[PDB]
Design a protein around this ligand. Sequence first.
Ligand SMILES: Cc1cc2nc3c(=O)[nH]c(=O)nc-3n(C[C@H](O)[C@H](O)[C@H](O)COP(=O)(O)OP(=O)(O)OC[C@H]3O[C@@H](n4cnc5c(N)ncnc54)[C@H](O)[C@@H]3O)c2cc1C
Lengths: 666, 133
Amino acid sequence: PSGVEGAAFQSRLPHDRMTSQEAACFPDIISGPQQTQKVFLFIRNRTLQLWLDNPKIQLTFEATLQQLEAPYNSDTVLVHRVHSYLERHGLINFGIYKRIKPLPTKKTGKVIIIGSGVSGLAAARQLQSFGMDVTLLEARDRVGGRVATFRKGNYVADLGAMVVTGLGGNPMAVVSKQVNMELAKIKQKCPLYEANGQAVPKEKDEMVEQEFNRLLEATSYLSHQLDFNVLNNKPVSLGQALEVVIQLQEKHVKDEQIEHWKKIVKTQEELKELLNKMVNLKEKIKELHQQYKEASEVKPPRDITAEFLVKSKHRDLTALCKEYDELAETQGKLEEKLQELEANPPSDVYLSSRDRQILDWHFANLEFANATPLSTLSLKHWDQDDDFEFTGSHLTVRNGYSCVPVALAEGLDIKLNTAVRQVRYTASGCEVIAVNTRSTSQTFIYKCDAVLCTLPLGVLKQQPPAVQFVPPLPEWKTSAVQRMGFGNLNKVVLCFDRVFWDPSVNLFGHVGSTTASRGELFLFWNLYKAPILLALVAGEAAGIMENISDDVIVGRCLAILKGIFGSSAVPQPKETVVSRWRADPWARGSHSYVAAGSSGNDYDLMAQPITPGPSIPGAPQPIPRLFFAGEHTIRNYPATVHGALLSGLREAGRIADQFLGAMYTL
Amino acid sequence: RKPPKGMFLSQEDVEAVSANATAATTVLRQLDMELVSVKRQIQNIKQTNSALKEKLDGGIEPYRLPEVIQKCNARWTTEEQLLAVQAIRKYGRDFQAISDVIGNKSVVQVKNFFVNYRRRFNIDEVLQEWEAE
Ligand SMILES: Cc1cc2nc3c(=O)[nH]c(=O)nc-3n(C[C@H](O)[C@H](O)[C@H](O)COP(=O)(O)OP(=O)(O)OC[C@H]3O[C@@H](n4cnc5c(N)ncnc54)[C@H](O)[C@@H]3O)c2cc1C
């Protein structure tokens, strides 16, 4: 879209309707007359537009009111409320921008942020922007977390996040204007090459792909229409559902063959019954002919009974010769119907070996997309976030995605090599205990009003725990941590001296020979200026391939590539790197997912803050102290950089509302 | 509300393929064996019908007669009346058969004969003799 309505779209808001969050901050307006609502909506949309047209500089309330016309610039407090709303919740004045009003003289409140990934960094900027004292604690020797970029010489390649998934509605659109990201579009054409090294024929590639998509719709029919979501008191996975659907197609193939060969026997037994009729009738005809012959031996002149015998046997014989001729025509009709039937059999198989292997590539690609084996995904809910997907083509970050967190880190107080061990929270405040990752006896204590935890879901899941909470987290939180899925996905970076692949193709597949190994080195990316190829390890292969050494993995990569491009065309690589995200103790995996028996609701549960008990008995209901952001806390944009960013912006708004108050809600 | 084209999924079949650890592979072997036994019965009947066609070798060509053509004359000769009375005794009321035997009488002409000579050839008695067999 475009205009003020495009600004709503670009900020993930409906242009013509007030959201639930807006209703909470502006109950007077939404409960009030429909005319005032349109005024609110225009002010909001216009203010957004002004920010979006130039996100390189702060949009002040003054500048906003400057560019509003009548009747919209009538009520100046309404405009101030709307501006403050949008600012507080990070819809405007987020990321890296030049501030018109320098940061306030004195800081108010103190916040510790655990983790310096995008969710932490984005929250930290907002809180500092609102005038709070912020310190981030990071276990690694760098910022960015799961945004990790390999840099050696002029080779640049992302071992973590590398793709912006469309700019239409994406807050990373705004960040790409604020920071120089060399966004290059990704052409989606992806030729598949079988285990032998031979390309899959264009006709076959389409047949299998269409079947994959039909198999997926089929699982959705299973889920919604047949209600096949529990089986033996166990939630059904997407993988199970796909097996069941595939088995039923194999069954249908067999049922069609059965009723086809049943038509052949029914016809063959109809022919058998006709041929027996004809054998017996031919035997009667033979006998009756002899009798006519004998009656004709009696030469004339003859009495009338002897004449009658000749004439009546003649009649009887032609009557039987008629019958045989009719049966003989029916023999021809049944015999041609047998050639019809035998020439046109149904399908011999549902899927051949080559078909089923190519299909497993499409399943591997889906396992890459959800960063987990299909047997773990909830049938009902695996695609719950599809409706919020952005428009526009996907883009690669060509200069390395680390440029984003590094830019967000500027001006913030970040303690690197600082591993949080314990988080204490009481009615009076909080105490974060951390150690130095190098010399672990060296201990640090950080005292604060509030803790924002951006620890990954894999870390929160650790048993025995890496980080202890005092008091422990309540069961409603720990059960959500348990139920939520935390998948895995690895990359192999191959740096060469020269390009030996098609420079016009961004990606190409490799079909493995087994279902078990379908995710193993199944897809190669060509995204960078330098000659770099990136190989993916998805599905069940990701976890297994972490216990195999780099030399062996790189060897398997070259083996495959020699197969596609020829043995003398593929040199030994100059530099190689292999990610191991499940082994990494500050990650313990890659992406969250909706596991079978989880739902989108667990993402909301992850986002909910914790309020400690009262210090002394009968003291009033204390204030919320422990907050949660990160990839795994945002229902509509989970498992993404933009989701992490948004969750950070969310919590900064919630924390500031709490510890600085919200003047705009009156 | 409807599953995609060429995709087959019914409540009954889903319950049949689920509900055991190996209900799937049971149901699919059951149909493999049903298929092989139906193809058994085809090879069986093809050999039977192949033998029945050996016996029909020749057709009915050596046992066929020429057709005699003659104009439907309305004059009953004594010869033809005597042929009719015997044809009635053999065939009953099958007027078509009686006509074919006599050779030069239409089916209506035969039905007239039944009426005209009922008394004189005791056609009632001749039909009772036929009915008795
Ligand atoms: C292989 C791979 C590919 C990906 N590709 C894409 C993509 O193409 N597009 C996309 O949008 N997203 C992608 N992602 C996802 C994206 O990287 C994450 O969703 C996002 O970066 C996570 O941000 P976060 O701030 O929620 O968590 P993190 O970035 O993990 O930040 C949490 C921080 O906490 C730190 N930490 C852990 N334990 C402690 C401790 N005890 N004390 C202090 N600090 C601690 C970590 O070191 C880390 O810095 C990918 C992820 C992986 C693994």
